[PDB]
Design a protein around this nucleic acid. Sequence first.
RNA 1: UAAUUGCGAUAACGAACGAGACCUUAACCUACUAAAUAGUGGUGCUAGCGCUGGUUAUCCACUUCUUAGAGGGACUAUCGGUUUCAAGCCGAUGGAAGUUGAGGCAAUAACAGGUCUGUAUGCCCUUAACGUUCUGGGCGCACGCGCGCUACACUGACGGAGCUUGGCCGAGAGGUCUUUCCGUCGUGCUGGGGAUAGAGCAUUGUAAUUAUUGCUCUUCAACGAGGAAUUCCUAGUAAGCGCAAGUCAUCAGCUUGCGUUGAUUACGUCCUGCCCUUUGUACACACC
Lengths: 199, 85, 144, 149, 48, 112, 126, 73
Amino acid sequence: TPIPEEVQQAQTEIKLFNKWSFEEVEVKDASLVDYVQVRQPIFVAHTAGRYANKRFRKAQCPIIERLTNSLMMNGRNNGKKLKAVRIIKHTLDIINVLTDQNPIQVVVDAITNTGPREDTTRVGGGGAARRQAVDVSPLRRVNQAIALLTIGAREAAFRNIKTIAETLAEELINAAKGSSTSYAIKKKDELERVAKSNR
Amino acid sequence: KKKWSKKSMKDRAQHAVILDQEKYDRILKEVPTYRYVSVSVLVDRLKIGGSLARIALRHLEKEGIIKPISKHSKQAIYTRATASE
Amino acid sequence: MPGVSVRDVAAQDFINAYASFLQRQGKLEVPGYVDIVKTSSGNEMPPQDAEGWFYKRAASVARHIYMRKQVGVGKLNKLYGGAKSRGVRPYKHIDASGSINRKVLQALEKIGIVEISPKGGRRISENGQRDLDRIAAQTLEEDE
Amino acid sequence: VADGVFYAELNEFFTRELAEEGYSGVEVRVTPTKTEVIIRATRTQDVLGENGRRINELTLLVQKRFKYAPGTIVLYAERVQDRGLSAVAQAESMKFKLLNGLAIRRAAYGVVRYVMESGAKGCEVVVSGKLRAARAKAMKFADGFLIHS
Amino acid sequence: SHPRRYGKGSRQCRVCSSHTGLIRKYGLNICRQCFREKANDIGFNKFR
Amino acid sequence: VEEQEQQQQIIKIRITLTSTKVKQLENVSSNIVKNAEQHNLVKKGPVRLPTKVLKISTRKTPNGEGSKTWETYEMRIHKRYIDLEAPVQIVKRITQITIEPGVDVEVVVASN
Amino acid sequence: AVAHVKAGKGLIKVNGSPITLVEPEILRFKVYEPLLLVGLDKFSNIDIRVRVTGGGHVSQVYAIRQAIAKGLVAYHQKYVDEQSKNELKKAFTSYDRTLLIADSRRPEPKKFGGKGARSRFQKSYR
Amino acid sequence: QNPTHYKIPAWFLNRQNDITDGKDYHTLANNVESKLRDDLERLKKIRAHRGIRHFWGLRVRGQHTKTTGRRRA
RNA sequence: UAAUUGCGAUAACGAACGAGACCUUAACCUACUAAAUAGUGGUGCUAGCGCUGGUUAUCCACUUCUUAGAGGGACUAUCGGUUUCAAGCCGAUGGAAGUUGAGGCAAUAACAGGUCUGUAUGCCCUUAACGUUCUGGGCGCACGCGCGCUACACUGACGGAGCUUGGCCGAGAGGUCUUUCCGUCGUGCUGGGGAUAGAGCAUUGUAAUUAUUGCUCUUCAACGAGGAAUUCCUAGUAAGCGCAAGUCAUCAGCUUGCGUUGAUUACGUCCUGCCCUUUGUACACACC
């Protein structure tokens, strides 16, 4: 005889903190969508050493997993995962609360906007150093997107009287709505400015 | 330094922010744009202190005008209103 | 469900519930020892009154005891506390905890809660489990 | 630890007495208050010699350090089963030629030559630099297999 | 003729003449490396 | 405490036999023999119990000087083999002591 | 009685589960599961498979977790309950298969070469 | 500056004269800061090393010299 | 291909040796043969209100713990692909893939490397002296260089909460009759940081002052994340929290191992070290 966990007395049970659904989330960009896996996550975590393999579609990824991990990290020093998950658990809820839309969908929207079209590697050749503009490679767009969004959130927390979760929500929403106030979009638009020009 | 105000508790005690102005303007006015907003986002936008927003939320809670939920870092969400369900 | 709940709730909701019951005991004499700095560097007592210094230290120790046992003055002291080797610029903390432990343990002896071994440490009595378990009865109903 | 400590004093003290001496190799096996002390020596005559003192004396020589007990001891004489795998004579015979001399290059070749005839699979001799009192060349020379490592 | 003392302290082999050393076994800290090959003690044969 | 078995009633039994060697291969074999003897004798004792490990692994710069990587490398594992009998007769003590295969195996009869 | 213990593991912590089938109450350290464990979203992970399956009352899971870092644990506990059933119903084979499971990593802490500051982490100068 | 249940009066037989302890002055603030100024001259009239260093002018309790003190002066 | 590693050719046919295999073990699997340190079940003492669980009990069993062995070693027999040919490349299953992972078994010979003071031997100084046994004192420092240790502050800072004792008893340090939640923080050169200073107290020791450690207490120092610039690291690794061993009468942490926390990038050779072939060479203790 029961007692047990309270959820719904069931159906298919949506997990992802038990709060939100992943399947509804659309990646508009046809190119981008392929790399971004959301055919069947939750939020628990996991490593798996998928290996670098190149050219064709490389590995599995969860967007969320990447976002928590960047936060613990950047930065700099001395961040633990129990706090790092916690801040996101709350951040997702702040984001949902601001938008009235699925937090994963906003995360997607942020990342797709912040991920530039083109970049600007620095090559020495002959007697001088040129930038000819360089590939984006679809995971690297994603990685850069998250990193940029993540530095911005940190920068705000440090400077202003705000906990991370809100700085992270704010920076993400702002990117997710195409406003230059976010660090992440401002750098995207710069990086694509420089890459187009330097050709 | 630059300087420096909202600043609490002494402003909290005196009438100027506690009475009406802060609870009605800041907390209550924000809510019609977003049904819920987090206690900490709400701190930062309003420019109101975390401690300062916290008692105001609590008065409002008693009233039944707002309803909080929780989380440990005295973060949570703040909601006003809501319904027929 | 309740008795077993002494053992099986998350410690805090147990300690918070329990501390109000403790509050009733007559004892709770601190006599001025606490006042210097009991622990690392910002440890004083005025936040102590609700579930402080002293009162959580008792309430919980009792929560700990049920599950575990046997114990002693030593066992208690760092249970809570640090005193990590130092890269020699530090402290993190100095937890003393030699005075602290002694004060908590003393009160308990007067009421009759805790008993003293020759080799073993601190054991719980028939008296000690009774109060813990009986209060636990109230706790579970509130929670669910 | 401490049983090993008993162990931990005893062989090095066997090594230091069993050094330069003309003899051949020393196992020690320790029961309660006796040390077996098997020597594989021809020159076991010098250590032995019945009642007297001699036979006892190198063994009783074990007795003092760390080990053990009011008691007498025992010693057993033994033969050799092929000198190469352990001895002291294997070391010493080259040492006795390296005193007054002979051709050094010949001594290196010769010593390898005996044991390799006796099978060995490998023997390697190395001889210090300062040959003819010159610099230090240092010299190797090995025949067969032979593998320390 | 009278007597004397003071500069007591730890131990070292005879086999090596230096004071500084490791106590458990009873020789000095290189004498110990020479000894480590030997084995003598339960343990050390070699290598890691 | 005393595993009771005549002789004016045996009130002796408490043996602990602790066998400590350098080589595992050699130790095992000696150990095996102890177990068989108990069984033959009249009443059967228990088999080999081998518990836990003694390490000194001590990490030392050779030395040059300088030796600043790449140290040369040295391991003590060893092992303690603890064999009871269920019954300690007089006959049992004698057969085991008289014929003892220890070479490097250091076997201490201990203690009433 | 009924007691099937087939012991998984993957990451540190040892979960032995001897399962006597009755009511779906669950113990961990022999202490009730939702109440201790608290500090959760990842705890409810376990809880899926004593719900979604459509068998609720078929498992009193008795699980004893002893020893490491609260997180590592979760994978081990699950395997044992799934293998046991797979023996009896071999038809509910598509319950192990379809609800995922497995890895571990297994590679717990790595060797210490000298001079590396933590272990291979050479230090630090030209 | 001084409370009800706690209090500290200087006691001892006479002398030692200087410096003394005054039974742990609290009394902190000006009286502490202005106390050490005297305590230093007193420590000099002592002939302490601690007093000679006060006269020498150097880092008191012998700091390391491999590096340091570059902001200080 | 890490590998004259192995194959296919070849004026060669062999052959050693390093590599690999070998051992070690962190991983492992264990279903088991072995035994119990221990895990787990059955008592008995209660508490909720043998029903649900806590405790210890008697050598009563089997087992993940234990450990010694065994066997499972995992690899392109085995399902697979175009293809001089042997192959490479990628994939199933599994618990990891052809170098399963460490470099710890690392070749000879060199560099007048380095050690005469971590370990002896020539040979001079010299020889009842650079014997001798000490006692007292030295490892100060206008500046450079090195390693290391702590900070600048919210992923924080504070307090409380998740050779070794029992226990009366102590500001800390001690002596013995005696075997991760929540008050607090307001992003403040501060509740940051602990530098330096000064008085005074216990222990180690004969002594603590240049040369103990712990500090009650109080001075409250620079430093706002670090130039020109550097070092490693290829997933339990970088980086971070601590602990015990050795050191050791004392001693900053040395050096050193166990666990615990836990990330990012890993294409390639696109300044530096190297390998084999290649040509040229006026060099040959060798582009210093």
